[PDB]
């Protein structure tokens, strides 16, 4: 999954 | 079969109702609303909750049986009971309209006080001014001022895992103004990252009874709708929150 906190 | 039920009110007192054993939550809420004299309009601003911890209480779904909950958690010690009456409301303007309803003011005031004690409402910088209005029991002026603080009418959930956070947890924070996910550590200590989701970005949402997860799908900026799962044991309560927010947004009667 792609992390929404990736910035 | 008749049974008695103890329920806590926002002011620390408790009330006892004699109610049918298999009553559902709304039925018990209506019995309680009547014994404390809530009027026809106040009754829609409060709901039944279950105390989970010092820092979290959870709203009872319609299909529960409060007496079952009450016995499950009953002992002879306890400060009293695991059932409590709490405000159920996200838009603070409908609150202001009730300022001339002594019952509702009293309930709004004592809960606000206790949510200040708990850290929910971030009143630090006017703490003394607020303290002075409390001591004089100027309840409506205390509330008209506390209502401007961060965290007023926000539902904060216990930290848990999120499928869009490879490591660390989220603490989800829900209000009429938006959906916030706070990045916190494994144990719940806050990082310093946070995401505000506009409600108009919320495309759809569900629960997953088996994965024990709440789910929401958002389209933000320009990208393609994406699903996020929150692995909270309170997925139903969080689902009730989404539905309640969209309901209150449809009937928002003020431009401010």
From Swiss-Prot, chain A:
Coiled coil: none annotated. It is found in: Early endosome membrane; Cell membrane. Belongs to the FAM21 family. In human, WASHC2 has undergone evolutionary duplication, with 2 highly homologous family members WASHC2A and WASHC2C. The LFa (leucine-phenylalanine-acidic) motif bind directly to VPS35 of retromer CSC; adjacent motifs can act cooperatively to bind multiple CSCs, although there is significant variability in the affinities of different motifs for retromer. Acts at least in part as component of the WASH core complex whose assembly at the surface of endosomes inhibits WASH nucleation-promoting factor (NPF) activity in recruiting and activating the Arp2/3 complex to induce actin polymerization and is involved in the fission of tubules that serve as transport intermediates during endosome sorting. Mediates the recruitment of the WASH core complex to endosome membranes via binding to phospholipids and VPS35 of the retromer CSC. Component of the WASH core complex also described as WASH regulatory complex (SHRC) composed of WASH (WASHC1, WASH2P or WASH3P), WASHC2 (WASHC2A or WASHC2C), WASHC3, WASHC4 and WASHC5; in the complex interacts (via N-terminus) directly with WASHC1. The WASH core complex associates with the F-actin-capping protein dimer (formed by CAPZA1, CAPZA2 or CAPZA3 and CAPZB) in a transient or substoichiometric manner which was initially described as WASH complex. Interacts with VPS35; mediates the association with the retromer CSC complex. Interacts with FKBP15. This is WASH complex subunit 2A. It comes from Homo sapiens (Human). The chain holds residues 1266 to 1272 of 1341 of the full protein.
From Swiss-Prot, chain B:
Residues 153-253 are annotated as: FERM-like region F3. Residues 101-149 are annotated as: FERM-like region F2. Residues 1-90 form the Ras-associating domain. Residues 1-90 are annotated as: FERM-like region F1. It is found in: Early endosome membrane; Cytoplasm, Cytosol. Transmembrane segments: none annotated. Widely expressed. Expressed in cells of hematopoietic origin (at protein level). Involved in the retrograde transport from endosome to plasma membrane, a trafficking pathway that promotes the recycling of internalized transmembrane proteins. Following internalization, endocytosed transmembrane proteins are delivered to early endosomes and recycled to the plasma membrane instead of being degraded in lysosomes. The PDZ domain mediates binding to a subset of proteins containing a PDZ-binding motif at the C-terminus: the specificity for PDZ-binding motif is provided by the 2 residues located upstream of the canonical PDZ-binding motif. The PDZ domain also mediates binding to the retromer complex via direct interaction with VPS26 (VPS26A or VPS26B). Belongs to the sorting nexin family. Core component of the SNX27-retromer, a multiprotein complex composed of SNX27, the WASH complex and the retromer complex. Interacts (via PDZ domain) with a number of target transmembrane proteins (via PDZ-binding motif): ABCC4, ADRB2, ARHGEF7, GRIA1, GRIA2, GRIN1, GRIN2A GRIN2C, KCNJ6, KCNJ9 and SLC2A1/GLUT1. Interacts (via the FERM-like regions) with the WASH complex. Interacts with SNX1. Interacts with CYTIP. Isoform 1 and isoform 2 directly interact with DGKZ. Isoform 1 and isoform 2 interact with HT4R isoform 5-HTA(A). Interacts with MCC. This is Sorting nexin-27. The gene is SNX27.
